[PDB]
Amino acid sequence: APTAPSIDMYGSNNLQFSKIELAMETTSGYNDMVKYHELAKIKVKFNQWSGTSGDTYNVYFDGVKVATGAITGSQTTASFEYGQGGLYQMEIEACDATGCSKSAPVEITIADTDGSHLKPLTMNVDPNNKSYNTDPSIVMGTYFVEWGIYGRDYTVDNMPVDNLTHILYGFIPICGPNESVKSVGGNSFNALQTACRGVNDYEVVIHDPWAAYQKSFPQAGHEYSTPIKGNYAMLMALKQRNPDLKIIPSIGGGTLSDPFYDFVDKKNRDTFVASVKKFLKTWKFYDGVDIDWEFPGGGGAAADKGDPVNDGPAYIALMRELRVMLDELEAETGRTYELTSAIGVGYDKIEDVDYADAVQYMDYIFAMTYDFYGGWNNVPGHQTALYCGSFMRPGQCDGGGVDENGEPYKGPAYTADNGIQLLLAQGVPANKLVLGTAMYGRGWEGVTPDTLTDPNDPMTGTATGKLKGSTAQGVWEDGVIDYKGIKSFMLGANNTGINGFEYGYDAQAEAPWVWNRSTGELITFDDHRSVLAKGNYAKSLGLAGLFSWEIDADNGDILNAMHEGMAGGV
Ligand SMILES: CC(=O)CCCCn1c(=O)c2c(ncn2C)n(C)c1=O
Numbered sequence: 001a002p003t004a005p006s007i008d009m010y011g012s013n014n015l016q017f018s019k020i021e022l023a024m025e026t027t028s029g030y031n032d033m034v035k036y037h038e039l040a041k042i043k044v045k046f047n048q049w050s051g052t053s054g055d056t057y058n059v060y061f062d063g064v065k066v067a068t069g070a071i072t073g074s075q076t077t078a079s080f081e082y083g084q085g086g087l088y089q090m091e092i093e094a095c096d097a098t099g100c101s102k103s104a105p106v107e108i109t110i111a112d113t114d115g116s117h118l119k120p121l122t123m124n125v126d127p128n129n130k131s132y133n134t135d136p137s138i139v140m141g142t143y144f145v146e147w148g149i150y151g152r153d154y155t156v157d158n159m160p161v162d163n164l165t166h167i168l169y170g171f172i173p174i175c176g177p178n179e180s181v182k183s184v185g186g187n188s189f190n191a192l193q194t195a196c197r198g199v200n201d202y203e204v205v206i207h208d209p210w211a212a213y214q215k216s217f218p219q220a221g222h223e224y225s226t227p228i229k230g231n232y233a234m235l236m237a238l239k240q241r242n243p244d245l246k247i248i249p250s251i252g253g254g255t256l257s258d259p260f261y262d263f264v265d266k267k268n269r270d271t272f273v274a275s276v277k278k279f280l281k282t283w284k285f286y287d288g289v290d291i292d293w294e295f296p297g298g299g300g301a302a303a304d305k306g307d308p309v310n311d312g313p314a315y316i317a318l319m320r321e322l323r324v325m326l327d328e329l330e331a332e333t334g335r336t337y338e339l340t341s342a343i344g345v346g347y348d349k350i351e352d353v354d355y356a357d358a359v360q361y362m363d364y365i366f367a368m369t370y371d372f373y374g375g376w377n378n379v380p381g382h383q384t385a386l387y388c389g390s391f392m393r394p395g396q397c398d399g400g401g402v403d404e405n406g407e408p409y410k411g412p413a414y415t416a417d418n419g420i421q422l423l424l425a426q427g428v429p430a431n432k433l434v435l436g437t438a439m440y441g442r443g444w445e446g447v448t449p450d451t452l453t454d455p456n457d458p459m460t461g462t463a464t465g466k467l468k469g470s471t472a473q474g475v476w477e478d479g480v481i482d483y484k485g486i487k488s489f490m491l492g493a494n495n496t497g498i499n500g501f502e503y504g505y506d507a508q509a510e511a512p513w514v515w516n517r518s519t520g521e522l523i524t525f526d527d528h529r530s531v532l533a534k535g536n537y538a539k540s541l542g543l544a545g546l547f548s549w550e551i552d553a554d555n556g557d558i559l560n561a562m563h564e565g566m567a568g569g570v
Pocket residue numbers: 147187188191207208255
């Protein structure tokens with residue numbers, strides 16, 4: 001016989017609650033901005049403006065009692081905890097000695113990071129991505145980059161997810177020595193320093209919390225009160241649409257790998273593995289971890305780091321210790337968690353790790369069969385060829401010979417086949433290796449006809465510097481161009497060359513190029529033909545499948561060719 005409660009929607013945070021507490025309106029240290037709670041804190045204000053208030057309230061979710069407390073006037077705040085994410089029909093009843101009066105039901109949301117409070121994501125995929133019926137046991141992976149939501153304007157709902165088995169989310173940094181990030185310029189290092197305030201060295205953090213969980217995306221139905229927004233909320237709604245898709249955070253990458261060189265000290269590995277565990281308990285849409293250390297032994301961005309004696313065993317110990325940790329998580333959750341890694345495949349990178357040993361702990365190795373040549377020097381070559389190109393010298397392919405000054409080659413040339421064969425030769429099983437495809441070109445300026453030693457092969461020329469171009473043409477950094485930019489501005493609709501470019505294909509190497517004889521612009525990339533060759537190769541060897549770098553740079557053609565190449569290899 002009290003007055004039935006009316007719920008104050010605006011005074012109760014629009015009934016949006018969450019197991020994870022995320023700062024939405026600042027940028028600060030990771031432990032300050034993100035706190036995961038086993039019980040969500042619920043606070044609901046309700047009013048009984050007329051009649052009698054009564055003396056106690058009970059709260060029901062879908063008919064089940066979940067909280068009780070005292071009413072002592074005409075406005076009450078009910079505070080309680082609840083442990084399960086989801087949407088629920090909430091009623092609040094007020095009671096006195098004579099009876100109870102229940103409010104009308106209203107939906108309350110309790111967010112959790114598995115996306116259990118979210119409907120399947122609405123997609124907006126370019127229709128140039130076709131539908132395939134590829135065997136679901138073949139890996140078809142890609143990297144989605146966190147910063148792609150800015151100038152590249154490529155969001156989670158743009159991904160052709162039904163053509164993917166694995167989404168690797170690039171990248172999760174590690175607090176600590178990070179001079180390589182500083183050297184890149186822009187705001188990357190400053191962002192990282194902020195995220196690491198109050199964080200122990202060697203723990204993972206989110207690099208850009210605005211991209212990850214703050215930015216409101218209209219296409220995803222995000223509102224002011226939505227407790228999780230950003231790319232991560234969209235990946236959560238994506239797992240609701242595609243529950244079998246694996247979404248894996250990739251830790252490291254070329255500029256973020258500095259802290260891995262300190263993993264020869266086991267205390268640093270323990271700190272890092274513990275932070276990864278906490279990370280996967282906090283962000284439950286993720287299905288494992290991808291380790292992208294570029295590179296054990298050195299030769300990467302950090303010119304002053306790398307230990308060819310100790311980094312390999314440290315890498316193998318890291319994989320064992322991660323696998324132990326992921327086994328605990330599988331025990332706690334009943335889920336399967338995957339452990340993978342993207343690796344350099346030049347002989348000098350491979351030789352520093354016993355991968356046959358590492359790989360017993362791992363689900364897959366993503367072999368980085370690209371970046372073999374590029375604008376960091378003026379030597380043209382195929383950056384992603386399967387085999388040795390026509391431009392190579394006698395004995396260069398297998399490393400038997402000498403260069404143009406008579407210097408002996410130090411090892412086999414950089415090709416996908418050389419890398420894959422070296423890994424098989426170590427005893428890595430073919431069905432754990434995933435072959436990489438480039439959705440971008442690397443290129444040079446200045447490779448004009450007078451520099452060529454073979455007048456029909458620009459790979460025999462010499463450059464003056466890196467390819468220059470605008471972001472409109474898909475050039476986001478010097479020397480690098482999106483595949484969709486090469487297609488729009490160099491190849492044209494018929495793949496025969498526009499704007500002063502001509503198309504060529506080195507049939508020996510299985511590698512395409514476009515060349516502008518007058519500017520001497522030369523770009524090496526993967527196209528439909530070379531990606532079919534890769535698919536045939538992967539099929540021949542019984543590899544796990546294919547992956548690509550990076551999804552925002554494709555227009556559909558490369559991922560389509562990945563699927564066609566895997567079907568059609570003979
Ligand atoms: C600038 C900010 O808000 C957080 C840091 C983002 C990190 N980041 C990039 O922004 C980026 C990038 N490459 C190109 N860009 C534009 N990398 C490698 C990166 O880590």
